Amino acid sequence: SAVQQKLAALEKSSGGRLGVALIDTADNTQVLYRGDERFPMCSTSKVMAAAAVLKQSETQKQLLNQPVEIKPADLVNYNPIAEKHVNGTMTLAELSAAALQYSDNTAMNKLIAQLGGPGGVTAFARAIGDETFRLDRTAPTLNTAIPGDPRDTTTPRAMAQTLRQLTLGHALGETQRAQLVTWLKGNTTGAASIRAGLPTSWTVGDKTGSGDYGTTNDIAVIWPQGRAPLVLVTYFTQPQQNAESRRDVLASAARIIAEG
Ligand SMILES: *C(=O)[C@@H](NC(=O)[C@H](N)c1ccccc1)[C@@H]1N[C@@H](C(=O)O)C(C)(C)S1
């Protein structure tokens, strides 16, 4: 096609490996680039953990109000919000918001513990029809992003289809869906990623990720005004273990996608 030529040229100019999946819900048409290759999800897997807790709250009506202790031993590499409530408590709602909007790794580990381990997160993916998503580790070691390692990976095609069913489809309840959409719209980490390549008039809910090997990820659901929504997944990884993050590549991929 044409978008695929520019995405291929962008990837060639970056020195790394790019994965992109677009779903246009108007005709259920898809644009993919390496859409069936595995990529390290890094923190974009937090959307699946928050959605799995939300699915539990459909039965446990007061689940999101349940307090959870934050103890000093719970503290890991990056904890912007849970650092503030050490030796205190946080509800599951505020942990889900910390995980999605600030990418708090302690908050993610509390979501994983609430689901009974990483296998509880993968189980929820399979229950909604995602046979590709696999979460094996807690944070931060899920961000190792080793080339060829299948752990904590997915493909862009599967992630785009899953994010659509969670935020646009009916894989969740209506109250649960709207709460996740509200959370993703309030993300604070994605200004330089997919958001930077889209028209300002567009409202975006997204979750970013990053890890070793210069892994730089972003998944997003886009609402253009007067237009049916879109789902966009951009994954990027590099050959150097110490490589710097390349959020500019995700913006460029999004800009290429938005043009056509
Ligand atoms: C998931 O992607 C998380 N990433 C990490 O914990 C990495 N080990 C890390 C990379 C760089 C600096 C600190 C930790 C969290 N989500 C990232 C993101 O959304 O970009 C993060 C850097 C905010 S941490």
Side-chain angles (χ1 to χ4, degrees), residues 41-46 76-80 99-100 102-105 139-144 187 189-190 193 207-212 215-217 245 247:
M41 303 176 280
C42 291
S43 289
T44 58
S45 59
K46 295 186 180 137
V76 309
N77 68 316
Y78 185 65
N79 311 121
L100 294 168
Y102 296 90
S103 221
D104 192 294
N105 287 333
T141 72
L142 64 89
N143 305 306
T144 44
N187 184 31
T189 53
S193 294
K207 175 73 193 82
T208 59
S210 77
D212 299 351
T215 307
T216 317
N217 306 324
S245 302
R247 287 175 282 268

Side-chain angles (χ1 to χ4, degrees), residues 98-254:
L100 294 168
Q101 314 186 319
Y102 296 90
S103 221
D104 192 294
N105 287 333
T106 295
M108 164 66 156
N109 288 351
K110 294 287 172 182
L111 302 183
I112 299 178
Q114 163 71 28
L115 308 174
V121 180
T122 306
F124 170 83
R126 307 276 182 282
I128 71 178
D130 188 333
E131 280 71 14
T132 305
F133 175 106
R134 56 173 298 171
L135 179 68
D136 300 80
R137 282 172 299 174
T138 55
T141 72
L142 64 89
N143 305 306
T144 44
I146 312 309
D149 187 7
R151 290 181 300 180
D152 312 295
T153 66
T154 194
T155 63
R157 187 206 287 274
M159 200 42 111
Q161 176 63 19
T162 298
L163 186 64
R164 171 177 182 188
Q165 298 291 309
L166 301 179
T167 61
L168 293 194
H170 307 275
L172 285 184
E174 309 91 341
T175 293
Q176 282 62 37
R177 193 225 272 131
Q179 175 75 53
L180 177 70
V181 170
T182 296
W183 272 324
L184 296 169
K185 295 198 172 143
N187 184 31
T188 77
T189 53
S193 294
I194 284 178
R195 284 165 194 271
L198 297 189
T200 285
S201 170
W202 295 20
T203 37
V204 178
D206 84 294
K207 175 73 193 82
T208 59
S210 77
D212 299 351
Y213 289 92
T215 307
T216 317
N217 306 324
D218 201 7
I219 62 178
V221 48
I222 324 293
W223 297 266
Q225 321 198 199
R227 171 137 182 52
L230 309 157
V231 178
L232 183 56
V233 165
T234 44
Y235 284 150
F236 185 65
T237 193
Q238 314 180 63
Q240 277 58 243
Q241 189 204 62
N242 33 54
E244 286 308 305
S245 302
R246 292 291 293 281
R247 287 175 282 268
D248 70 283
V249 172
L250 306 181
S252 300

Side-chain angles (χ1 to χ4, degrees), residues 25 65 85 91 150 190 218 230 258:
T25 75
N65 306 280
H85 308 290
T91 62
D218 201 7
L230 309 157

